Amino acid sequence: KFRPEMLQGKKVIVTGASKGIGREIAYHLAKMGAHVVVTARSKEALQKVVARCLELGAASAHYIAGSMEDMTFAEEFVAEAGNLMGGLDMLILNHVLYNRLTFFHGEIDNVRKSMEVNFHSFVVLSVAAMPMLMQSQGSIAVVSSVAGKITYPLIAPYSASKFALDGFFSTLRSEFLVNKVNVSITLCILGLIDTETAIKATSGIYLGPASPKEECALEIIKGTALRQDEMYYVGSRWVPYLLGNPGRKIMEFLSAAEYNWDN
């Protein structure tokens, strides 16, 4: 069970923090007395956030700005950021490439770019951060979407990348348990959330309800802090049990007794 002080003094990277969910993640961590390095492309907007973060109780608040389409920038960024903070407790992977909701028409360069931005970078950031996460016994929050467990018409490129996140990071969870690595990995499954970029992108296309950016941020923090395997905030109490696949839990358990562990 959660208390705010499980974040006070903790060092933390929020990505996609220049607006929406990511912006609020950063704010609440700052009400908690956390140190943050926040990141995104748009410098102005990032200063606007560090400043408010300091105005609300963060221990420190720096920003670094760059495109995550850029793997060296991902690598380097992680290092500056640890160095700024004396290390790292929790890595919040929250950014994404912007996509319109249309039928797919052959746009390969879109499938590719969305794969870089929403999957490859997550893994590099993760790989750069791992030494300090290991020493800290810390945590990585992998922000994803109902569209990373099922599929909606209009976002094939997006969903491919979010599906890949489950597959890669879930396997990483399971290796870490077996090897007694105490870096937790919380896959965060978000129903629609009322960010401007997602109101603007769905008006007159998707009709379902939208849950609030502020709580969505918070719940991400909470489930990451509690070392939850998964954190569903999809606007319902029932629906997580229809997205989370008991079939798969059962299968993963059984299948594990089919390895020669000793070897």
Ligand X SMILES: NC(=O)c1ccc[n+]([C@@H]2O[C@H](COP(=O)([O-])OP(=O)(O)OC[C@H]3O[C@@H](n4cnc5c(N)ncnc54)[C@H](OP(=O)(O)O)[C@@H]3O)[C@@H](O)[C@H]2O)c1
Ligand Y SMILES: CCN(CC)C(=O)Cc1cccc(NS(=O)(=O)c2cccc(Cl)c2C)n1
Active site (annotated) includes residue 241: no
Nearest distance, CB of residue 108 and its own copies, angstroms = 6
Select 44 or 259, whichever has its Cβ closest to its own copies. 259
Q: Which amino acid is at 182?
A: N
The reply on whether position 164 binds its own copies by CB under 8 A is: yes
Say how far apart CA 202 and CA 118 lie, in whole Å.
20
Residue with tokens 């700005």: 65
Rounded-to-integer distance, Cα 144 and Cα 156, Å: 14
Q: In what order do the strands lie in the sheet with 11-14?
A: 60-65, 35-40, 11-14, 90-93, 139-145, 184-190, 230-233
Which of 63, 158, 232, 233 is the catalytic position?
158
Question: Among ligand Y, its own copies, ligand X, none, what binds residue 224 when CB lies within 5 to 8 Å by partner kind?
Answer: none
Verify binding: residue 152, ligand Y, rule CB under 6 A.
yes
CB of 122 to ligand X, least distance (A): 9
Nearest to 18 by CA among 60, 79, 63: 63
CA distances from 125 to 8, 57, 77, 117, 180 (A): 23, 26, 8, 11, 22
Chain-centre distance for alpha carbon 116: 15
What residue 72 binds from ligand Y, its own copies, ligand X, none (CB within 5 to 8 A, per partner kind)? none
Catalytic residue numbers read 158
Q: Which residues contribute to the site for its own copies (CB under 8 A)?
A: 71, 103-104, 106, 108, 111-112, 115, 119-120, 123-124, 127, 130, 146-157, 159-168, 170-172, 174-175, 178-179, 204-208, 239, 241-248, 250-252, 255-256, 258-260, 263
Q: Which residues contribute to the site for ligand Y (CB under 6 A)?
A: 96, 98-99, 145-147, 152, 155, 158, 190-192, 197-198, 201, 206, 208
